[PDB]
């Protein structure tokens, strides 16, 4: 059966043009496996899997692969270029574009009353904020994705922009049947929602009694081995008195005084438990358990939304000491929500119903595996709605063309300095990587890979002939990036910094030092740095970039992959 699911996933992938390879494999303790898998064409296009056996792990990873392919999630941080942005469809043939209105209100056919209120309580939200990153196509309008509201059965259109910023990869799954995927999606919503409550409210949870654990000897053996290897484990029921199908497992690493909390959910208690333990060690051997944090008594810090966001991103957030209290805030419950997938779905939906929460579900068949994306506003959100104002991944796209065209530019000095001011008016953090802000797959072998806003200001100051500013930002750049620069790029900045420092020396004659600089930095770096100081060529190591990004090999590879999916969408619809 498993050997057959695997084979069947692998065949459907080949048939889509995807050649996948197992990269790294781990069996750190008995009954715990993880595997990493990627595109041969494309190493950044990967998933991971976990399980009680080698085969289970691989099936997990291929499952996740279809989950991420079906939701376009590999591509969610990137702009897909001018051609795709004007093609027949961008995300799905299904999608609906709502062009902007004169007073820039959110167009009439998007969302529903509940959602408008949830995302926009102050009624201060505008349509131009909602342009999806992938297209950036303001003229074409707001791309909305169809979801099915479960209370009735109505299709609701939700801006991709809102999905991408607030829900990220949460509530997504693949499965063998439509409902099976739905159940996993819903389970995951509960996993992350309950996780956040446990953490943010500093809840002391009830231990799973040893007689319950002993129904699951494979997990027990995994646990005991971890203990035996120097890692105390706490196994907790996270149901909050039987409300939710959630387990929590925590690991201590006494070597450095830290803890690491893993949360899993499934209608079957045993399976939830196994999943929680297998996720704990996913991607990690026993030498990789040293990057976590000590518990804390500062509950206010534990509760901060950013701490929860961190926990979602890498599980390296703060946990309260209270989670480990002798006495629990809830009795243990030997819960169970299992049944047929149809039963399971209804059981989980009933929970959402008693909570008075609407569920929105999109289903995808088009790669020949069932997959869903589920949104439960007030429960499935990873980032709070104000992020549509403060941390929108689309903000930054009006400037893309300007910035992509700085290499080779030749504007008047004033223009470049105004751009520094624009970047400050628009509020960009000096540490923001420019590639993330604009959605570019750069590759590692150019200056764009490591270009943050602060460095960009330095280049702009150089091109605009303001050397007081250029020095400020060049220092900033050296302080916060020499680490990651190639040796050639770091040498260039070291040279440049020295030259900018020298230019502020009112009692010193530059020609006295030129020979010494050539010996320290080499002639090319000196030539290049001096050219940058003249404003001649400030955009050191930045090649110019077209609208379809032919300049970046990485980004071309990304789009070759994406085209395979655009193909499969066209067939299916």
Q: How many residues does the chain have?
A: 573
CB-CB contact of 376 with 352 (8 Å)? yes
Q: Does 557 bind Hg ion (CB under 5 A)?
A: yes
* DSSP code at position 545: -
With CB under 8 A as the contact rule, the residue among 135, 165, 491, 566 that binds its own copies is: 491
Q: Does 508 bind its own copies (CB under 8 A)?
A: yes
The structure tokens 């409210």 sit at 201
Sign of the torsion angle spanned by Cα atoms 78, 82, 83, 86: positive
With CB under 8 A as the contact rule, the residue among 505, 524, 546, 563 that binds its own copies is: 505
Q: Does 44 bind Hg ion (CB under 5 A)?
A: yes
In the complex, the smallest distance separating the C-beta of residue 499 from its own copies, rounded to whole angstroms, is 11
How many residues bind its own copies, per CB under 8 A?
32
In the complex, the smallest distance separating the C-beta of residue 240 from its own copies, rounded to whole angstroms, is 19
Nearest CB to its own copies, comparing residues 510 and 544: 510
Q: Does 516 bind its own copies (CB under 8 A)?
A: yes
Degrees, nearest 5: CA angle 146-114-240: 95
Q: Does 399 bind Hg ion (CB under 5 A)?
A: no
For helices 178-200 and 341-354, give the axis angle rounded to 10 degrees.
Answer: 40
Q: Which segment (39-47, 280-288, 486-494, 541-549) binds Hg ion by CB under 5 A?
A: 39-47
Q: Does 440 bind Hg ion (CB under 5 A)?
A: no
CB-CB contact of 93 with 146 (8 Å)? no
Contacts of 52 (CB under 8 A, 6+ apart): 31, 32, 33, 218, 274, 278
CB-CB contact of 422 with 415 (8 Å)? no
In the complex, the smallest distance separating the C-beta of residue 495 from its own copies, rounded to whole angstroms, is 8
Q: Does 512 bind its own copies (CB under 8 A)?
A: yes
Q: Which segment (185-193, 220-228, 496-504, 549-557) binds Hg ion by CB under 5 A?
A: 549-557
Q: Which segment (8-16, 193-201, 373-381, 488-496) binds its own copies by CB under 8 A?
A: 488-496
> How many CB atoms lie under 10 A from the CB of residue 504?
10
> How many CB atoms lie under 10 A from the CB of residue 566?
20
Q: Which segment (438-446, 503-511, 530-538, 558-566) binds its own copies by CB under 8 A?
A: 503-511
CB-CB contact of 47 with 61 (8 Å)? yes
Distance (Å, whole) CA 336 – CA 328: 20
In the complex, the smallest distance separating the C-beta of residue 209 from its own copies, rounded to whole angstroms, is 16
Nearest CB to its own copies, comparing residues 332 and 513: 513
With CB under 8 A as the contact rule, the residue among 117, 501, 523, 570 that binds its own copies is: 501
Q: Is 193 helix (H, G, I), strand (E, B) or coil?
A: helix
Bridge-partner residues for 207, per DSSP? 236
In the complex, the smallest distance separating the C-beta of residue 564 from Hg ion, rounded to whole angstroms, is 11
Q: Does 213 bind Hg ion (CB under 5 A)?
A: no
Q: Please, what is the end-to-end C-alpha distance for the chain in angstroms?
A: 31
Nearest CB to Hg ion, comparing residues 45 and 423: 45
With CB under 5 A as the contact rule, the residue among 6, 10, 22, 42 that binds Hg ion is: 42
Strands annotated E in 322-458: 360-364, 370-375
> How many CB atoms lie under 10 A from the CB of residue 159?
26
Nearest CB to its own copies, comparing residues 6 and 467: 467
520 binds, among its own copies, Hg ion, none (CB under 5 to 8 A by kind): its own copies
Q: Does 360 bind its own copies (CB under 8 A)?
A: no
In the complex, the smallest distance separating the C-beta of residue 557 from Hg ion, rounded to whole angstroms, is 4
Nearest CB to its own copies, comparing residues 380 and 498: 498
Phi, psi dihedral angles at 265 (to 5 degrees): -140, 140
DSSP notation for 437-480: HHT----SSSGGGG-BHHHHHHHHHHHTT-HHHHHHHHHHHHHH
CB-CB contact of 443 with 552 (8 Å)? yes
Distance (Å, whole) CA 90 – CA 136: 11
Nearest CB to its own copies, comparing residues 153 and 512: 512
Q: Does 513 bind its own copies (CB under 8 A)?
A: yes
Bridge-partner residues for 37, per DSSP? 22, 47
Distance (Å, whole) CA 106 – CA 122: 13
How many residues bind Hg ion, per CB under 5 A?
5
Per CB under 8 A, contacts with its own copies among 231-290 are 232, 252, 254-255, 257, 259
C-alpha distances in Å from residue 104, one per residue of 49, 125, 129, 147, 426: 44, 9, 9, 24, 19
In the complex, the smallest distance separating the C-beta of residue 254 from its own copies, rounded to whole angstroms, is 6
| Helix (H) or strand (E) segment spanning residue 237 | strand 233-237
Nearest CB to Hg ion, comparing residues 42 and 472: 42
Q: Does 514 bind its own copies (CB under 8 A)?
A: yes
Nearest CB to its own copies, comparing residues 350 and 501: 501
In the complex, the smallest distance separating the C-beta of residue 554 from Hg ion, rounded to whole angstroms, is 5
Distance (Å, whole) CA 315 – CA 320: 14
Six token digits for residue 197: 């409550």
511 binds, among Hg ion, its own copies, none (CB under 5 to 8 A by kind): its own copies
Q: Does 327 bind its own copies (CB under 8 A)?
A: yes
Q: Does 23 bind its own copies (CB under 8 A)?
A: no
Distance (Å, whole) CA 137 – CA 84: 10
Residue ranges that bind Hg ion, judged by CB under 5 A: 42-45, 557
Residues lying near its own copies in the complex (CB under 8 A) are found at 232, 252, 254-255, 257, 259, 294, 297, 321, 324-327, 487, 491, 494-495, 498, 501-502, 505, 508, 511-516, 519-522
């Amino acid at each position: 059966a498993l050997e057959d699911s695997i084979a069947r996933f692998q065949q459907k992938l080949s048939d889509l043009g995807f050649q996948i390879e197992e990269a790294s494999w781990l069996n750190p303790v008995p009954n715990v496996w993880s595997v990493h898998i990627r595109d041969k064409e494309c190493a950044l296009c990967f998933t991971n899997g976990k399980g009680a056996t080698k085969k289970a792990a691989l099936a997990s990873a291929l499952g996740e692969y279809f989950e991420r392919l079906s939701t376009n999630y590999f591509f969610a941080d990137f702009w897909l270029g001018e051609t795709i942005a004007n093609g027949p469809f961008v995300h799905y043939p299904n999608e609906k574009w709502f062009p902007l209105t004169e007073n820039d209100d959110v167009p009439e056919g998007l969302l529903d009353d509940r959602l408008r209120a949830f995302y926009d309580p102050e009624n201060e939200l505008t349509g131009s904020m909602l342009i999806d990153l992938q297209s950036g196509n303001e003229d074409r309008g707001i791309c909305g994705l169809p979801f099915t509201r479960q209370s009735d059965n109505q299709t609701v259109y939700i801006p991709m922009n809102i999905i991408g910023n607030l829900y990220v990869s949460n509530g997504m799954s693949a499965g063998n049947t439509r409902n099976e995927a739905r159940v996993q999606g819903l389970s995951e919503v509960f996993e992350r929602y309950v996780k956040n409550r446990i953490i943010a409210e500093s809840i002391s949870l009830p231990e799973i009694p040893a007689d319950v654990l002993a129904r699951y000897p494979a997990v027990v053996e995994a646990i005991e081995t971890l203990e035996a290897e120097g890692f105390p484990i706490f196994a907790y029921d996270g149901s909050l008195g039987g409300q939710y199908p959630v387990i929590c497992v925590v690991l201590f690493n006494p070597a450095n005084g830290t803890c690491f909390a893993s949360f899993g959910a499934h209608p079957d208690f045993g399976v939830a438990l196994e999943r929680t333990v297998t996720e704990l060690l996913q991607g990690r051997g026993l030498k990789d358990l040293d990057v976590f944090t000590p518990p804390t008594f500062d509950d206010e810090e534990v509760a901060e939304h950013t701490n929860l966001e961190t926990h979602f991103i890498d599980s390296s957030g703060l946990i309260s000491w209270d989670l480990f209290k002798q006495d629990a805030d809830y009795p243990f419950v030997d819960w169970n929500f299992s049944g047929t997938t149809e039963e399971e779905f209804a059981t989980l939906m009933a929970i959402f119903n008693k909570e008075d929460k609407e569920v929105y579900i999109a289903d995808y068949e088009h790669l020949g595996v069932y997959a869903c994306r589920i949104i439960v506003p007030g429960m499935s959100d990873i980032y709070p709605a104000e992020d549509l104002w403060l941390a929108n991944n689309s903000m930054g796209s009006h400037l893309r063309e300007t910035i992509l065209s700085l290499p080779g530019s030749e504007w008047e000095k004033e223009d470049y300095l105004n751009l520094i001011e624009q970047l400050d008016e628009e509020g960009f953090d000096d540490f923001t990587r420019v590639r993330e802000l604009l959605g570019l797959a750069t590759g590692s072998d150019n200056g764009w890979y490591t270009l943050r806003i602060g460095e960009l200001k330095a280049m702009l100051a150089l091109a605009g002939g303001d050397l007081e500013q250029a020095l400020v930002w060049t220092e900033w750049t050296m302080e916060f990036n020499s680490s990651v620069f190639s040796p050639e790029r770091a040498n260039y900045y070291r040279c440049l910094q020295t030259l900018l420092l020298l230019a502020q020396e009112e009692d010193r004659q530059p020609l006295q030092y030129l020979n010494a600089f050539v010996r320290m930095y080499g002639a090319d770096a000196v030539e290049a740095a001096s050219a940058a100081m003249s404003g001649e060529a400030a955009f050191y190591g930045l090649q110019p970039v077209d609208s379809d990004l032919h300049a970046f090999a990485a980004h071309q590879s990304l789009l070759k992959a994406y085209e395979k999916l655009q193909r499969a969408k066209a067939a299916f619809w």
